[PDB]
Each structure stands twice: as C-alpha cells, then as structure tokens.
Amino acid sequence: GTITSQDDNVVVGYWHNWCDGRGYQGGNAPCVELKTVNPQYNVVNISFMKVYDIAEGRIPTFKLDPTIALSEAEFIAQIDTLNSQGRSVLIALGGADAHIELTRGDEDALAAEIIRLTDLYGFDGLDIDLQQAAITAKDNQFVIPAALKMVKEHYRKTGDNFMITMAPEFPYLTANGAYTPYLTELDGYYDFINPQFYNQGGDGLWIEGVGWIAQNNDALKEEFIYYIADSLINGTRNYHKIPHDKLVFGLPSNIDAAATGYIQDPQDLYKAFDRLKAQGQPLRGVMTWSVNWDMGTDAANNSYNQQFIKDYGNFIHNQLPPVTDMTPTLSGIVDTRVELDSHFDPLIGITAKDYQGNDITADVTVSGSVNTNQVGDYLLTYSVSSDDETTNQPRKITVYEILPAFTGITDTTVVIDSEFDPMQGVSASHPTQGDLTANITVTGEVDTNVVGVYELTYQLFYGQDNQQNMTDKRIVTVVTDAVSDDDWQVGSTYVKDDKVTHNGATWTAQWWTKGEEPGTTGEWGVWR
C-alpha cells in the first residue's frame, strides 16, 4: 500500500519484533501477527530498527525475526492490509538497550536506509525511541534530525506525509533536556510526540501550590496526567512545549509491560483528558507499550485479554479531530552578561520558525535597549508573529565591570644605601583596558640612607576619564648591613663583659646571668 498517515486522534501500540518477552511481574508477551492487532490501534510501531551487528557498520536497520513465522512477503502483506484499513505502521528506531552512535556525515546513509526500508515494507513513518546513551551519543542529535528532514522532504515531493513521531521518556523533556535538539530541529516535521510516562519511578514534577506529583503515585494519577500534560502543552514548569494537538500520552498496557506507570483506574485518565479539553487543549491520543502485552499473559497464565484497548480505544477515538496550535517559536534566547563598553548585538544567535518549521528569523522584532556604557540590568523582549499568532520571550542583559589588578606591590626589605625604585616590578592590568602600569601613582618615599620603615601608597586610576580608583599599600623596610652584638636570649647564660643587643640597645653583663631581660634591671642591676 501507500504512505498512510493519521489526521485524527491516535491510539498508538508498539509491536514486538520478538517472541515470549518476559514481564516485570513474571508474565509473558507472545509474538503476534500484525493482522491480529485490534483495529482500534490505528498506529502500530514495529520495534525496533537498531544496529544488529557493528560489523555491518554504524547505520541501523530492521531485520524481521523469523521465529514470528511471517515470511518477508507475508509481513509486507499484513502491513498492506493495515494500510488498506487506513491504519499506519511506523518503524520505531532504538528501544531499550539499543546503542546507536552516528558521526556527522552519516545522515545521507541513514536517510537512504530509512527510505529503502520504507519502500520495501510499506512503512508510513518512523518513531524516534532513543534511550540512555543513544539519545546523546556522538553526533546523533545532529545526524538523526538531519536524516529525517531529508526523508520527510523526499516523500513530500510525491505528495506523501511520512510520519515522524518520538517516544522520549518524560524526564528528558525539560526545556534544555536531552531530547530538545530532536524536538527543535524537527519542529514542523513531526506529527506528534508520544512520551513515555512509565518506568520513571518517583520522578515527576513540582506544582507551586500542590507539591510533588510522582509518576508512581497511584493516589494522584489524575493530577499527574493533568499537570504534566498541561506543562508540556504550554511550555510551563520547565518543560519544553509540545503542542496539545501533537501530544499523545504514553502508558504501559498493564503491570507486566513496565515496572511503574500503569493506570490502575482508567477514570483518572478520562478525567484528566476531560480537564485538558475544558481549557481548550484536547490531547491527540494515547500510546502503549505494547499490543503484545495487551494480548499477553500474567504469571499465573491468565490473559490480559486486551484490557488496555478496552479501557482507552473508544474514549480516545470518540473525540473531535485535532485543532492545530499555530504559534511560532523563538530559539537561542538566553540571558547574557556583557562587559562594560563591549559591543553587543541583540540579534546574533537568535532565530524563529513558524508552526510548519519555516524560518521566519527576519520577522523577529526586539524591544528595549542595552547601554553597554553603563553597568546594570537591561531587559529586552523578542517577538515574532506568524499565522495570526505571536510568541514573545524576554532576555535580561547585565552589564558588569571587572576591577583591575596590581602585581608586584608586596612588602619588602632592602639594605641601607641600596637603590630603590618604587615602580620596579610593579604593574597593573585589566581585561579590556590592557596594561595600566602608566596609570599608577606612588604616594610616599623610601629613604634607603636612613634605617626604618617606609609606607608607600600605590594608586591606580582607570576607566572612563581615569575617574575610577583603587589603592594598595606597601611597606618597605630599610635595614643596616652593620654587624651587631647577638640578640639577648632568655634561656642563654651570660657572664661579665658579654654583650647583647635587646630592645634597640647594646647591653653589657656585669656578672653571671640567665633569664634577666636587659632594660628591666634598674639603675644598678646585671645589664647596663
């Protein structure tokens, strides 16, 4: 069949390219034929395209597991059957424990392989399900989006919408998180995102005013679904924005399918989705790992018997078609610190796209202004409008100054009659003004002919018109070279006529002494 895409809500189910997968609670997921998957799964994701063996190179591929007992041709035929029913069959890239590591330049070969597989099997698109290191390995965050843009454009030439979806684990969807390169580079290209709201334990989000709402909290599941979706579809609470018409809520089919995240009471989902509809932002569907688990068994060999599709198929399909959120995006805006008097260009690094991913950078306007000749904060607001919508974002620009620094102003002792130059070895620097040594003045003098302690005050003048100042003090001690009688020591023994220096004077012992301080023994004592 032909490239078959979905214009309305979706119930997405992954399909295991393997048999008898073990459950987190000891159950079993059989392989199943595609033709047996419930019709209400209108998107079925073949899992997974990956690197099967590094000896075939870096480019991932898909290899049907023959033990499912579908020949290549029969598998093809069953995809065609789904397509004839108006259902989409995507290829899912990655999965758990799949390492993919591509280098800049690999994009052409990756696109070529996606096209080859797509044309051979009749796939309708690709789901990005990179996990763990594969999300950020080498140049993946560049190569995979680059390849996918090529694939999208290739099929657009013939009037076909090759679907692009993604299945990020939700924690990666913070505003600057690991998936954000895939989301931004593919804005306009992707059909919807179905994040995984499972296998993350106690992770979740903080709602100012209700507290922490965790993905494994079964008492607050309605609030979990509502608030995490609300944050995604509006770009609030530190999440990257995924428009509501493009957000599909990914879930485990049952307790065997994922460690945590199963919805015990489907009412919690119905109500959360209704609340999102009530604020004008209905979601685009649900997704599940997996149709195999939905048709699987538990540890007691009891059948799950399609409970997931029973709970959610009709609820999600019995909804109005999606209404596109046509708001444009701005990229590259970050609060920036600028050194006093440096040049600042408010447009550099900032771009914009309409909701279809067309570049509309030239249409960005900025209000506010920065005065780099004055330290302080300056607030800019960037705006762009397209498609009867507007997006705005602020940017704080802080102008700061750095103090210069002196070198070589350290206390020093010099010998009598030596030459002393107060500027020898003395300098000052500043990162933008450069060498400021010629801007140093010296208050005070050293007289090296006269023993004693001389204070010098160094002043540095700098900045505009040399009206900024900083000061540092230096002590220069001039000492004689003259040989003196050895210093008195409290523990030494002296006898008549021994001489000692103490407290600035030379004293002579008049008899035997130990422990008596010169100067403290009066008019007629041992030291004179």
Ligand X SMILES: CC(=O)N[C@@H]1[C@@H](O)[C@H](O[C@@H]2O[C@H](CO)[C@@H](O[C@@H]3O[C@H](CO)[C@@H](O[C@@H]4O[C@H](CO)[C@@H](O)[C@H](O)[C@H]4NC(C)=O)[C@H](O)[C@H]3NC(C)=O)[C@H](O)[C@H]2NC(C)=O)[C@@H](CO)O[C@H]1O
Shortest Cβ 72–Na ion spacing (Å)? 16
Pick what 23 binds: Na ion, ligand X, none; C-beta below 5 to 8 Å, kind-dependent: ligand X
The kind and range of the H/E element at 16 are strand 10-16
- Does the annotation list 289 as a binding residue? yes
Q: Residue 283, class by beta-carbon neighbours within 10 Å (0-12 exposed, 13-18 middle, 19+ buried)?
A: buried
> Looking at beta carbons only, is 24 or 344 nearer to ligand X?
24
Stretch that binds Na ion, among 122-130, 231-239, 285-293, 488-496 (CB under 5 A): 122-130
Pick what 122 binds: ligand X, Na ion, none; C-beta below 5 to 8 Å, kind-dependent: Na ion
> Looking at beta carbons only, is 129 or 268 nearer to ligand X?
129
> Looking at beta carbons only, is 167 or 228 nearer to ligand X?
167
- Does the annotation list 217 as a binding residue? yes
| Number of residues located near Na ion, criterion CB under 5 A | 5
> Looking at beta carbons only, is 84 or 367 nearer to Na ion?
84
Shortest Cβ 307–Na ion spacing (Å)? 29
Q: Which of 300, 290, 296, 230 is nearest to 262 (CA)?
A: 290
Cα 525 to Cα 518: distance, rounded to the nearest angstrom: 9
Pick what 223 binds: ligand X, Na ion, none; C-beta below 5 to 8 Å, kind-dependent: none
Q: Which of 430, 427, 387 is nearest to 406 (CA)?
A: 427
Structure tokens at 87: 């259902």
Helices H / strands E in the chain, number of each: 8, 29
Pick what 404 binds: Na ion, ligand X, none; C-beta below 5 to 8 Å, kind-dependent: none
> Looking at beta carbons only, is 141 or 513 nearer to ligand X?
141
> Looking at beta carbons only, is 23 or 122 nearer to Na ion?
122
The residues, any chain, with a CB within 8 Å of residue 280's CB and separated by 6 or more, are: none
What secondary structure, in 3-state letters, does 357-404 show?
CCECHHHCEEECCCCCCCCEEEEEEEEEEECCEEEEEEEEEEEECCCC
Shortest Cβ 97–Na ion spacing (Å)? 28
Strand pairing report for 505-508 and 440-443: unpaired
Shortest Cβ 131–ligand X spacing (Å)? 6
Shortest Cβ 125–ligand X spacing (Å)? 15
> Looking at beta carbons only, is 123 or 198 nearer to ligand X?
198
Shortest Cβ 88–Na ion spacing (Å)? 7
- Among 83, 194, 327, 329, which residue sits at the site for Na ion (rule: CB under 5 A)? 83
Q: Which of 440, 443, 445 is nearest to 476 (CA)?
A: 445
Radius of gyration of the chain (CA): 38
Pick what 124 binds: ligand X, Na ion, none; C-beta below 5 to 8 Å, kind-dependent: Na ion
Pick what 17 binds: Na ion, ligand X, none; C-beta below 5 to 8 Å, kind-dependent: none
Nearest 10 degrees: Cα torsion 278, 282, 285, 288: -60
Cα 241 to Cα 238: distance, rounded to the nearest angstrom: 9
- Does the annotation list 214 as a binding residue? yes
Residue 122 interacts with Na ion (CB under 5 A): yes or no: yes
Cα 301 to Cα 27: distance, rounded to the nearest angstrom: 7
What is the DSSP annotation of 233-287?
A: HHT-TTBPP--GGGBEEEEESSTTT-SS---S-THHHHHHHHHHHHTT----EEE
Shortest Cβ 109–ligand X spacing (Å)? 23
Shortest Cβ 114–ligand X spacing (Å)? 18
Cα 366 to Cα 355: distance, rounded to the nearest angstrom: 20
> Looking at beta carbons only, is 4 or 386 nearer to Na ion?
4
Pick what 182 binds: Na ion, ligand X, none; C-beta below 5 to 8 Å, kind-dependent: none
Q: Which of 366, 423, 360 is nearest to 387 (CA)?
A: 360
Structure tokens at 526: 């041992």
Q: Residue 16, class by beta-carbon neighbours within 10 Å (0-12 exposed, 13-18 middle, 19+ buried)?
A: buried
Residues that bind ligand X (CB under 6 A): 14, 21, 23-24, 29, 48, 95-98, 129, 131, 167, 169, 171, 196, 198-200, 257-259, 289
- Residue nearest to Na ion as judged by C-beta position: 122
Residue 124 interacts with Na ion (CB under 5 A): yes or no: yes
Binding-site entries for Ca(2+): 214, 217
Which residues make up each annotated binding site?
96, 214, 217, 289, 293
| Interface with Na ion (CB under 5 A) | 1, 4, 83, 122, 124
